[PDB]
Amino acid sequence: XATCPAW
Amino acid sequence: XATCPAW
Amino acid sequence: XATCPAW
Amino acid sequence: XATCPAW
Amino acid sequence: XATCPAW
Amino acid sequence: TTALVCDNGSGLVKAGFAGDDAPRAVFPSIVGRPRHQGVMVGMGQKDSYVGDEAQSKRGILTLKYPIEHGIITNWDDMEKIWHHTFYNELRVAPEEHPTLLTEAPLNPKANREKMTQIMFETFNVPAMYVAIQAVLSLYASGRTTGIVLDSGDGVTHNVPIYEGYALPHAIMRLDLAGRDLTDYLMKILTERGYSFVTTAEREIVRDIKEKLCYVALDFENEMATAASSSSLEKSYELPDGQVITIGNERFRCPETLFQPSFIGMESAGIHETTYNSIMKCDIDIRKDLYANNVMSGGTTMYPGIADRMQKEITALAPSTMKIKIIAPPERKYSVWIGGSILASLSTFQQMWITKQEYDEAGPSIVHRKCF
Amino acid sequence: TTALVCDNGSGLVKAGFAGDDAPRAVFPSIVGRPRHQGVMVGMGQKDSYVGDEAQSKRGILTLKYPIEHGIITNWDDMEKIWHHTFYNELRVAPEEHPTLLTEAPLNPKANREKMTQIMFETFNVPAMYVAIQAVLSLYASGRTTGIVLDSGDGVTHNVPIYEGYALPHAIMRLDLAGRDLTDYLMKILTERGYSFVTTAEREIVRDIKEKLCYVALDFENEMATAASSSSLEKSYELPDGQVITIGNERFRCPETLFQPSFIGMESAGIHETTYNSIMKCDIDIRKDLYANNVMSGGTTMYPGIADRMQKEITALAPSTMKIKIIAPPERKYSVWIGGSILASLSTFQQMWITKQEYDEAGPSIVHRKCF
Amino acid sequence: TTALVCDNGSGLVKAGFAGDDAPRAVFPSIVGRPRHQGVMVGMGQKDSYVGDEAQSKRGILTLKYPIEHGIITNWDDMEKIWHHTFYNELRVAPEEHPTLLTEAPLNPKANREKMTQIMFETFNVPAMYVAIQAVLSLYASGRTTGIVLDSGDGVTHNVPIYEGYALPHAIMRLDLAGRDLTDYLMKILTERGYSFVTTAEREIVRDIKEKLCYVALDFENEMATAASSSSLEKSYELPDGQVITIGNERFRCPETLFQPSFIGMESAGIHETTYNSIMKCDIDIRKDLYANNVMSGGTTMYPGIADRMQKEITALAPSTMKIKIIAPPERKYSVWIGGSILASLSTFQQMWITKQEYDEAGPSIVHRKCF
Amino acid sequence: TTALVCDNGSGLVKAGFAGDDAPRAVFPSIVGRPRHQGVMVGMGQKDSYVGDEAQSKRGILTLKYPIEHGIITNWDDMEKIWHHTFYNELRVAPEEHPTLLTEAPLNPKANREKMTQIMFETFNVPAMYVAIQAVLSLYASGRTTGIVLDSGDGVTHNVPIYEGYALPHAIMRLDLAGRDLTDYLMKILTERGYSFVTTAEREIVRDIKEKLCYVALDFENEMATAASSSSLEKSYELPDGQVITIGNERFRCPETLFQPSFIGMESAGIHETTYNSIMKCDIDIRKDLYANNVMSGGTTMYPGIADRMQKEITALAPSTMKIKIIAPPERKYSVWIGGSILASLSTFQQMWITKQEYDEAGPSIVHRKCF
Amino acid sequence: TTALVCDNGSGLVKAGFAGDDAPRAVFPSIVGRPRHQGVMVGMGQKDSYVGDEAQSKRGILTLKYPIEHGIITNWDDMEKIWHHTFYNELRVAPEEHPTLLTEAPLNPKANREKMTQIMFETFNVPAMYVAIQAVLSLYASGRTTGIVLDSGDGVTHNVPIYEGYALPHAIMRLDLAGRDLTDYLMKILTERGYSFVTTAEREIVRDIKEKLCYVALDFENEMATAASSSSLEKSYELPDGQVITIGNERFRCPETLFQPSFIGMESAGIHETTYNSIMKCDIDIRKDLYANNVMSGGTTMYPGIADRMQKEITALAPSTMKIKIIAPPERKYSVWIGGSILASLSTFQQMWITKQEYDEAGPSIVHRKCF
Ligand SMILES: Nc1ncnc2c1ncn2[C@@H]1O[C@H](COP(=O)(O)OP(=O)(O)O)[C@@H](O)[C@H]1O
Ligand SMILES: Nc1ncnc2c1ncn2[C@@H]1O[C@H](COP(=O)(O)OP(=O)(O)O)[C@@H](O)[C@H]1O
Ligand SMILES: Nc1ncnc2c1ncn2[C@@H]1O[C@H](COP(=O)(O)OP(=O)(O)O)[C@@H](O)[C@H]1O
Ligand SMILES: Nc1ncnc2c1ncn2[C@@H]1O[C@H](COP(=O)(O)OP(=O)(O)O)[C@@H](O)[C@H]1O
Ligand SMILES: Nc1ncnc2c1ncn2[C@@H]1O[C@H](COP(=O)(O)OP(=O)(O)O)[C@@H](O)[C@H]1O
Fold first, then answer.
1. How do the domains of chain F map onto residue ranges?
2. CA F206 to ligand 1 center in whole angstroms
3. Mind listing the UniProt keywords for this protein, alphabetically (chains F, G, H, I, J)?
4. Cys-Cys link to I127, which of A4, C4, I98, J70 (CB 3.0-4.6 A)?
């Protein structure tokens, strides 16, 4: 959900 | 040289 | 029991 | 220098 | 000075 | 009543019955949809294709993966895949049997919680359970100590275990994967004049990687050998009918596992992560861990990978002790193998989660029971 | 001729002149070096950056700390930092003035001995001296008895002093630190979907900790309050432009100072160490130590930390006596404050180490003079 | 001794001297040969025509391009064009001056290697050098950060640069071109009764495109406006003397840059490629890249293209930050402008390749020196 | 019916049958419990470990001593140890045989009284008896006069005996121990960079002490010899595989028996206590006590300890008389040796305590009978 | 010109002017010196402390008595105490006034001879005189016959006097003291778990003795009363803040004055010494001595001591005669009271020792004049 782009 | 057609 | 610390 | 890891 | 121990 | 063992990794999906030595269903997890226009009327059509059938017709469809890093991104594509396994590929009723599912160590909480509702509410199935894909590698070996290493395709990680006691402050997780090795290869081949840019073109780049790639024991002299002599230069044909000649990129692609700077990711490497995992442990149980290095990833199948790890750690360990890397030949299905043992085990029968337990608390019961 | 007072802790570096109430140079101690490739020609480049300038450009560099636990690990990075203070940040000649340096209580011998050669041989500076960072806290209070407690970022420790007589068989040192609290926080945030893994990503995790964290007076009901009501749940934005929502991890991170089992380090805690330090002392001077607990660490700035230590020790002390924790509001620079007093002091002028004393004996003179 | 700056793109060929603000030779790169039979004797004939002369007599010849995608396809036609520039169009000796050539980012290796032999062996010319056509756009702006976007006629691509450090894992290249926009237009005009099928007919279809085409800010209401009202319907005459009436195909042709499905190429588009290029970068230097979008392609000259990119990215960026697209009015020759600065630069004079360097190693020296 | 002889000192526990020359069970007295989490199911687990088994697995457990100074601190841990000896290590029925236990001279009353109930009520055992661990050293020598000195690990003390008549106003007890010598050693080693802080780390500091330590005959010149010449500097390896180098701390650790100010305990020393014990005696039987100094402690095994006591007392005695320190080579088990003689002795058979005697008076019978 | 009266017993030191009813300076005679290390600089320090100031800071110092049995052991500590009285505590010039000193009956000769030089040579003081501390008790009563008994803290003794004629062949001296009663008490308290072993710990054992101790009239039934009923069991707190419970040792400590075998000293007792002193006298003046038993020791202050001496001697005297023990309530300062009378007496003025008498003979004049 932040800097990952799958989170 | 493969699938392009200029390579 | 006083000043030791096993008594 | 042994078990720390900065010593 | 003999058998006491302050003499 | 026999339990069901279902493994769902990134890529291949494996399933079977309990009490067996080999699975029955192995197929990739892809969802495809067409993109051109239909003309002819009399044919029977479908809006999507799921199993191996979508692999046969890749010249039309647009392929799509649901799982990216071990995280469920699209839930509606996931329900089609589980529906495909329970009915079409394998034939069973859902409400007859209990199931058993596997996950990753440090994924977030909502990943292992939304999948509780689906296995209870929309599938009326009793007695599910969730495991971790590092404990299940030791049951295939039958040991009780050691340190594991599984990569596969999603993530690489390692968990140290001593005498049945796990050490939670020593788990290391690295996001370098298997599909990142595919994507770096199709960048290097543009230096000779080959170009593969489509989601359909990607799978014939994967098939090159599995056939002719190796991990060299040295790196500097290999760049000088192949630059002078034309000895290791081989060839390969593709479904167009042409000939592709590949040399000097055979060993250069798996070298990013030892130097991740080629992508640009700044990290340590696959060998310093294993060394720092032992160093964060105690001082008295280090000796039983240098002699037990099991290794059971799907990516591990490159030739010459076992002798490379022998040479690297001895430069870091002190000069007295002894190292030993264990590599069984059937180390691809070993996560499914350990799942077969724990399901048919007698003591395990008090660790299930009944349906009444879900009605008392709800979907937050899974953080309490299983771990 | 005015003396120089230089404090070099782990992290921030503080310096100034003697006879003053506030320092002039406050900046972190980081050495960075680039990692990408240079392309454009006309710019003027440097191989490294030292002061606050390396903090401004963190999107390229790889940051690095020289000091880890209060021990100098890399000497070549240390000479760049002392050269940066004497010339660039503060402007002075080295050979004009005497200096004054501070250390830790139980560091090994070669740490306070290699730094004698650098302050004499490569810097032609007369009259240095080495102190201990617990005595210097009492001069800021002006008292003459009591027990101190300084943590900061390297190490936490405490020294009992009565009437100007120190008790060497009662000093306790614990290696739980400040940077270990940063590293445990970025492990907990992966339970919602946040991931910060880079040396550059570390500093925006530190900045969250300083703004919204508190030490709760109770622990068990706080886990039941925040699980039911959504009251203490706040938000924060980051330099990407997005929004982060944090609740239940605000108080859970500073609880490791009272239960160190969460890391895995097996020890006692910050309150039983203070209780066992008084108990190893005599029986007649315990009463003057329960009424004097000064407390001057950099880590001490959490809200609600003074009322927590009131409640804990009264469960261990007998029911008659009286406890009192003293906390001045400017308790961050207090180690520099006491250094300003002792330099301008009149009696002190026979305690310097002249340059001729080094030529007679050598670098082993420091174990005799200062203590 | 003044250096020579030669740009050879797909289509137009530009050249001039160093230290100037405008080139001197601008002409297309076409090689034509006749196809009918000669009858009259007294005239003087030639087998081929090269420069603007082949453009004047297109009613007989068969035109031919040497470069297709940025790749030299036919070498014998290329030697006629370089011979035409050094002697006929511009008058110079080759052996007197050094040269400077430009290329594309991800072309294969043999393209930039066969052109080393021609500039040394058959043309006795010292001190050549090869650059990249994205770095040279920043010198025309004078900045030192930002992200570029050049399309022209061969290929479209973009390179992010921060503080003189390029990021090699973020370069994106797309093969949608300028001549593909010409070829799609002459397919649409057959819906009214116009047919242009010859290599000579192609150039009067290009000349329609440059005069009356625009990029609409919206797409759905424009299809409903022009279907009801006959307002934007204009006219044009051709060298036969007739009248052509064109409406509804004016804006419909440049819409393939935003939806490439109209050709059938499956890709993302010109705006999602720029968004994914920033997203693959770091987290700390994204803010300086949303405020610096230079844009210097030859294809960029459509009216209404700057306001369209303002509207699109704000639907993808978060709601706080600020975007800014920079468009200088003389953005057509800007690749030649930056070539004039770097040649007359003082520091640059150690970056040439002398003739003795070629005699030591050979044609593989170019992969080491320049990059 | 043979009696049982059980010695339970601080640390090692020794036991055997009557009428023998050597014991059969020697093992430390430690109770350990785990602290990590269990994962693997199929293993068989225990909550605690008692004998030598807890020593083998010290990398998990938390070790714990029941006895601190010769005083039973935790009774529930003591019942596990006596249950381990009567059944597992040695195999016997409890109700078949009489027992015999040993104590310290000036411990409080409730220590030798709670252990009466356990040997009668929960263990149905007849005929127990309690002795004193200074009388039992003379039976191993066979003499009838002299002065003893036993230290071991709990406490050091000395009792003067003449012709079978003990002198109760001359007994001296000092609380300097054996485990205090271990704890001072691990403080000194932090001056070179070694740090051992865990209950598990303590036992590899004990093992250094037993191998290379000696008591020097002089102290001042030894500090000047080892500071100039590198002659007595030796080395040692640890179970990690590394090398430790120790010099100048070999003799410096047992010097606290002669100067107890290094800990901070203010007392006299091990030689002035023996001198003041003779001086408090009479004037006519001093001559038979200077010639009989038996010495049978477990701590006495340092090399060079017998020649040091020769040199010290002659500086205090008058110049005419003769001193003689007796040191048998098997002076470690000598407290068990004297217990074997007194049990098989014929006159002793009226000194037991029958079970009917406990039913008449109660647990206060032990202060009357035995002394 | 008023004379000075100085009493210096073992323990307390008393002084004042002549012609008064109460002294002015009462303080113990202790010399203390520090033992830890000084750290803080700005304080003002002293090497030793003498008066009541050394009593206030006992947590650091090592206390020391100069006088042991009535014999000056260390002369250098004695000169500090006399210097403290003449200047600091009491303010006077030494050369202005005559002095008056007291001693013990059978101390050796050099004790009363070295103190002649100090009162003449280093203190220029005229007219000293030495008395005996048994004659001075009768002046406080005003009688002229009787037998005295003074113990205090050094020695106990008794001198019979009839009609102003002393009987030198009847003086009895016993070395049982007051500090020996303190030392036996801190041996008995280790039977419950209390341990006080330091010179600083000794004074809080003295303070227990003065508050709750009594002399029982019978001994055998008191051992049976307190063993059955818990009636006389009291409590006391100490400066740590804890609670001490003492029963059965209240009366058991002063019973050694009647049976000295508990220490081990073989003698008669305090009542048979008084009976044998009368029996060695004549036959005609025994009747006036049974009716006059004055009793003026500092140790005499125990409750119940007067009724005990009534009961004991009537078992030894014949059945006709009458006994009577006299005990004034202010019997503590009575040795100073008699010193005030004899100094202000008119006939006494020819008994001084002038300074010229010392210059004629020397220090051996004191055995001739005073007696
Ligand atoms: N012979 C091989 N050599 C190298 N890589 C392989 C080989 N066979 C399979 N792989 C890799 O294994 C990956 C998936 O393996 P596997 O671990 O079975 O699946 P998962 O990762 O889902 O558990 C594929 O991405 C493929 O790249
Ligand atoms: N407001 C705050 N709350 C909690 N911690 C803080 C705060 N401000 C600073 N710190 C901590 O103080 C540490 C360093 O403080 P300081 O003691 O001044 O430096 P040093 O430890 O080098 O002497 C930093 O690591 C930071 O974590
Ligand atoms: N006014 C215009 N509007 C749209 N396209 C144009 C215009 N002028 C030129 N072009 C396009 O620019 C292309 C070549 O431009 P340029 O970038 O200068 O050459 P190159 O691509 O070789 O560098 C031509 O194919 C033409 O289609
Ligand atoms: N070779 C040795 N040198 C020095 N100390 C020793 C040696 N062997 C044993 N010890 C000490 O003896 C202590 C216990 O000895 P022992 O007297 O047998 O046990 P206990 O004191 O319980 O009777 C241990 O703490 C150990 O420190
Ligand atoms: N209330 C009391 N009960 C018992 N003993 C006492 C009491 N008060 C004082 N003493 C004892 O008197 C001793 C000294 O008394 P004193 O005779 O005045 O001094 P000195 O013996 O020097 O003349 C002290 O050692 C103390 O033990």
1. 1-27+69-134+334-367, 28-68, 135-181+271-333, 182-270
2. 10
3. Acetylation, ADP-ribosylation, ATP-binding, Cytoplasm, Cytoskeleton, Hydrolase, Methylation, Muscle protein, Nucleotide-binding, Oxidation
4. I98
